Amino acid sequence: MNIFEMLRIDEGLRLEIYKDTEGYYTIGIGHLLTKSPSLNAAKSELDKAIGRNCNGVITKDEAEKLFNQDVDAAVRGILRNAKLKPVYDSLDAVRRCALINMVFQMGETGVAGFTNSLRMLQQKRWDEAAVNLAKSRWYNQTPNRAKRVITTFRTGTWDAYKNL
């Protein structure tokens, strides 16, 4: 299991514009297009992102290309962020994937806000961090995905995904 397979399980693959759990316009493997209510705004962002007139639909290849960019941007983002970098540096390989997953879903800014949880992971207080991470809007809104990530931080293994 690796970061790509993990995120592909959590996000799904859709080749037509869709609305994510929060109601925003998304395409492919969790590639957020716009928070705007307009399907037109969305379709415009889409063509800008692909470099073609897509009219709301893309190919498997295009979806994966966007996915490759997003994962790369997530990693570079963590590495450039004063709050996340040190946490990332401190973790083992599996737990690193867990933090990457959070940043792909909620952005650098959002994860950087989990101050107390970041501190606990850095200290390697596994169980305590899992309990703190569960006290969030994140967990309440997308509980099955949050549980999978949380279990990953808790155990340092891919058990939560070995099912899936």
Side-chain angles (χ1 to χ4, degrees):
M1 176 96 13
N2 61 50
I3 193 50
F4 294 90
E5 304 171 359
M6 196 196 198
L7 287 157
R8 166 93 178 54
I9 285 158
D10 284 339
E11 297 285 354
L13 169 53
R14 318 200 25 201
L15 307 174
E16 67 270 327
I17 292 186
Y18 71 93
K19 289 196 210 212
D20 80 3
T21 68
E22 295 285 1
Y24 308 135
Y25 284 129
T26 304
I27 207 156
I29 307 146
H31 182 78
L32 170 81
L33 298 158
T34 182
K35 295 183 197 189
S36 148
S38 168
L39 172 79
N40 277 309
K43 275 146 115 125
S44 163
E45 280 304 309
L46 177 68
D47 291 334
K48 162 167 72 80
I50 294 308
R52 83 190 177 53
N53 243 64
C54 293
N55 189 30
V57 172
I58 67 171
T59 67
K60 190 165 172 152
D61 270 59
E62 292 168 345
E64 275 159 6
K65 167 158 243 197
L66 288 178
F67 188 28
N68 288 144
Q69 294 161 174
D70 295 348
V71 177
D72 190 63
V75 177
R76 294 186 279 87
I78 284 170
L79 296 172
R80 269 193 274 112
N81 184 295
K83 265 102 188 259
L84 301 176
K85 194 192 170 346
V87 186
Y88 187 93
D89 287 342
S90 78
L91 300 165
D92 60 270
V94 180
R95 291 181 168 99
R96 277 173 185 170
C97 289
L99 189 68
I100 293 177
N101 186 309
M102 290 183 72
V103 170
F104 180 94
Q105 194 187 351
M106 90 193 77
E108 213 197 289
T109 301
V111 178
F114 286 58
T115 298
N116 306 319
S117 296
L118 297 177
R119 204 189 73 253
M120 301 174 208
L121 291 166
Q122 194 168 354
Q123 299 175 60
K124 322 202 166 267
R125 290 171 179 229
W126 326 122
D127 281 46
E128 308 77 325
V131 163
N132 187 259
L133 274 161
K135 296 177 172 137
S136 56
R137 178 192 197 264
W138 171 61
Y139 182 84
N140 281 102
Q141 288 328 109
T142 44
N144 290 157
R145 170 189 195 152
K147 268 176 222 143
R148 287 199 284 283
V149 176
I150 285 160
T151 288
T152 304
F153 273 132
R154 206 181 23 96
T155 71
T157 67
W158 294 112
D159 295 342
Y161 287 84
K162 286 173 166 151
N163 271 35
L164 287 16

